[PDB]
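Notes to self after the Tuesday call (sharing in case useful).
The group wants a holo model before anyone commits to mutagenesis around the pocket. I volunteered. Ligand is protoporphyrin IX containing FE. Logging inputs and output together so the record is complete.
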Amino acid sequence: MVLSEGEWQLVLHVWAKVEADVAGHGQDILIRLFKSHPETLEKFDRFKHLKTEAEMKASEDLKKHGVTVLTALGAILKKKGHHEAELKPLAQSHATKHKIPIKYLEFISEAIIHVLHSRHPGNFGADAQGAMNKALELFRKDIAAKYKELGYQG
Ligand code: HEM
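Result:
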């Protein structure tokens, strides 16, 4: 799959808004992931004790993790497809140490889209959402191929 420059610009235009407060967007996205698919929280040994959204919102470490996650994703999106180097370390740690199934990467992609759709109607209309979905599908496709090369393809 290959995105056009126009599609990448729609992706980078809404990411620019996420960057106005990456910590707040990361909290919303991780909390939306854990609430919609609670089995995903079990993969975090640092955060699986959190019982409620209030506990998640008050966790300073979770917030800092959200910033780490979205900043790594932003660096991958800014590469506009040329993200081979960025995907190596990510795929190795997610396939071998954290053990994250592609289906869970699908879940977080769904959470990212949900949060952008509600926080940014001005930059996340139908065409912009379609472009972001395309960029995240490319990210999952390339990550899955790497998983396979690493011996996981889960
Ligand atoms: C857009 C997708 C994702 C990105 C860009 C992302 C990014 C990161 C980054 C940069 C780290 C820290 C460095 C590393 O260990 O590689 C990290 C750690 C981790 N990620 Fe991901 N991640 C993503 C999705 C997920 C998903 C869906 C899960 C689980 C359902 C997950 C679980 C973890 C865990 C368990 C850690 C370690 C947390 C800790 O510090 O305690 N990741 N992720």
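Two things stood out.
Residues 126-150 form the longest helix (25 residues).
The chain is about 70% helix and 0% strand.
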